[PDB]
Structure formats: C-alpha cells, structure tokens
C-alpha cells in the first residue's frame, strides 16, 4: 500500500488515569528515528513539540493529494496520538486540579523523521509539497533527502572542527568558569549550548 | 508567565551574554584560496596500436560533415580499406608524445579525425573534399614522413 495510513484521534484502549504534559519529551535532540529508515527522502524535525491527529491528518491529506502511488510511497513513521492532554470545565472555579481528558497527541522531539518517502521518485519533485507541509507543520522541520542529511552532518562536523574561538560554550560552561552556573541549566551539559527550551538552534556551530 | 506560550520564552541577559561570549567564530583564513592559485589508457593504447599497424595516417579537421556525410565517408573508407576514428585531443597529445612524433603535435588541434590505413586510400577522401567545398586534409603522416596539405594533394594527384 503506497499511501499514508489514517491516524485516529485516540486509541481504542483509553487512558483511565490522568497524566501530565512534560516538556522534556519534546525537549532535546531526539536520537530515535533520526536517520532514514528504508527511505531516500523525509522531513527531519527541526524542533520539538507534539503532533496530534489534526497535524497528522493535514500531512496525510497533503501527501495523498499530491503523490504517485506507482512511483512514490509514503509511510508515517510517527505514532498515532497517544499522550492525553486534558481541558477543564469552562466557567469553573480556578485551580482545583484536572478534569476528564480532552484530546490525544503524540510528542516528538527535535530530529525525528516524520514520513519516509520512497520509490521511483526523487526529493526534488516533492520538494514543493514538502516545503508547503513544513511551513504548515506543527513544529519547525526541514525536508532532507538521504544525502542531504549526510551533507548537513558533514557541514556541521566541518564547522565544529574549524572553530577558531579562544572560548567555547563548553570551554567555560563544563569548566563552570565565571559563575554562569548561577544561570546554567542542570541539563545544559547535554545540549552543549544548542537546544534552548522549545527552540532548536542547530545553526550555532 | 508560561514556559512556552504564543510569545517566545524569556532569555536572561546573563544567558544571552554568555551566548555572545559563545560566539562560534568560524575559521579565520590567512591567504584565502579563491584569490590564490581507465578509458583514457585504453584509448591511448588503441591509438598507439593503430599508429603502429597502419603505414599511412592522415589527420583532418573535418567537423563540417553531418551524420549522413559521416556515414557516407565511413562507407567510402569501408569500400577502400581506411580506418576512420577520432579520440580526445588531450589524450592524443600524450599519445603523440608516447609515439615520439614531433610534427604531428601542432597539427592535432580542435575538432579532428584520424584516418589510419595500410593501403593509401586518401584519394577518395580528396575527391569527397573536392565534391563538397572543404579542405580538411592538412598535416598527413604516410610512411614515417610528415606532409602538408599541398603534399597530400600532390600525393592524391
């Protein structure tokens, strides 16, 4: 089946107990689903967030609208909406906890591949549709082929190895040089000065 | 305020301060490079073998002949035994250097074509060049003797 499967709004098995929405599941560059998986072109998530059935359905509509099933197949690598984000009663007294669940959404961090595309089609023809999807996407992303991600990784490695600075973010930070530990994050040793909250700064060399 | 809202999240002047201290400066160039300064071997071997086997080799600058004209020339050079071929000029210059030919080095320039044969059959090519008003025969080499266009015309006559 060379088409994108439909993503349901919630699974058949529900979530009985209430749960919180932790930003750390979207924070940080994701390691899983970071490279191509039986694909030659995809969309790498250039930022963190959560995609619901609405964003997945918009992406599926935009994919099935412009695709050739005899030459281009697309498989959604992200799961269905599973994390329950709730909403309380309208015109209820403020505070006092959480009510019933509102809607499901699956959270994806930065670097995740969204839809793997393959077949007898290159990324150049689907580049326009991928750019329209990325501009309309829930989180920031970048349409990258199998070789484009490698080109970006090589460029990042070259930028890292060609640094000329007499001081680096780790060089003062992991050293805890000048008291920036009064403001340095506990998780800041992991992003190395590249992931700041919900925004992802890969452009920092 | 919220951790993540419609507005962007807050950055401390200390945070942006160290961030500017973390200015990832790219490499600083010194001299700058922009303002500073298998088929080929097989083709060369085949050209050397053709030069060694054939007694008469004629170099022409014929490019004016179309595909039909080239087919007619090939038919004429098949009726009387003359192998017509063309290779790269850069490859032929190494081929000419290996073959130790001095006078054929300046003749091979631009679009060119070699005609290598044991029996001399350049009179048919001369007649073809007479019929269609072009003079591609220039700088031939027959029996280890470099000739000119006038010498080729005299030999054809």
């Amino acid at each position: 089946k060379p088409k994108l499967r439909f993503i349901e709004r919630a699974p058949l098995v529900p979530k009985v107990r209430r749960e919180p929405k932790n930003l750390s599941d979207i924070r940080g560059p994701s390691t899983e689903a970071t490279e191509f998986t039986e694909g030659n072109f995809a969309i790498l998530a250039l930022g963190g967030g959560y995609l619901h059935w609405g964003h997945f359905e918009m992406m599926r509509l935009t994919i099935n609208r412009s695709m050739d099933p005899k030459n281009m197949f697309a498989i959604w690598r992200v799961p269905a909406p599973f994390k329950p984000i709730t909403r309380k009663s309208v015109g209820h007294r403020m505070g006092g906890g959480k009510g019933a669940i509102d809607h499901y959404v699956t959270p994806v961090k930065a670097g995740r591949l969204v839809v793997e595309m393959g077949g007898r089609c290159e990324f150049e023809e689907v580049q326009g549709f991928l750019d329209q999807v990325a501009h309309k996407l829930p989180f920031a992303a970048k349409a990258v082929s199998r070789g484009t991600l490698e080109k970006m990784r090589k460029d990042q490695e070259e930028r890292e190895r060609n640094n000329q600075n007499p001081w680096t973010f780790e060089r003062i930070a992991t050293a805890n040089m000048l008291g920036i530990r009064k403001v340095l994050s506990p998780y800041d040793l992991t992003h190395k000065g590249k992931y700041w909250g919900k925004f992802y700064m890969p452009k920092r060399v | 305020s919220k951790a993540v809202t419609r507005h962007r999240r807050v950055m401390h002047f200390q945070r942006q301060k160290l961030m500017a201290v973390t200015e990832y400066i790219p490499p600083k160039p010194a001299i700058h490079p922009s303002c500073l300064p298998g088929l080929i071997r097989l083709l060369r071997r085949e050209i050397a073998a053709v030069f060694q086997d054939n007694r008469m080799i004629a170099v022409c600058q014929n490019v004016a002949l179309s595909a039909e004209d080239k087919l007619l020339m090939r038919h004429q050079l098949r009726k009387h035994k003359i192998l017509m071929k063309v290779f790269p000029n850069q490859v032929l210059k190494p081929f000419l250097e290996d073959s130790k030919y001095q006078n054929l080095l300046p003749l091979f320039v631009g679009h060119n074509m070699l005609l290598v044969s044991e029996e001399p059959k350049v009179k048919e090519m001369v007649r073809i060049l007479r019929t269609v008003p072009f003079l591609p025969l220039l700088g031939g080499c027959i029996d280890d003797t470099i000739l000119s266009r006038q010498g080729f015309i005299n030999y054809s006559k």
Partner: peptide, 23 residues
C-alpha cells in the same frame, strides 16, 4: 572492455535521466 564501458555509460545515462525525471 568496450562492452563494459558501454554498459557503464548507459548506467550513467539512466542515472542522469532519473535525476532529470524530477525536473
């Protein structure tokens, strides 16, 4: 050989054609 060279040239031609297919 000449057959192998012709096959490689045909493969490169098909590759460039498939590249131009998106164009």
């Amino acid at each position: 050989s000449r057959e192998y060279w012709r096959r490689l040239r045909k493969q490169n031609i098909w590759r460039h054609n498939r590249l131009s297919k998106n164009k």
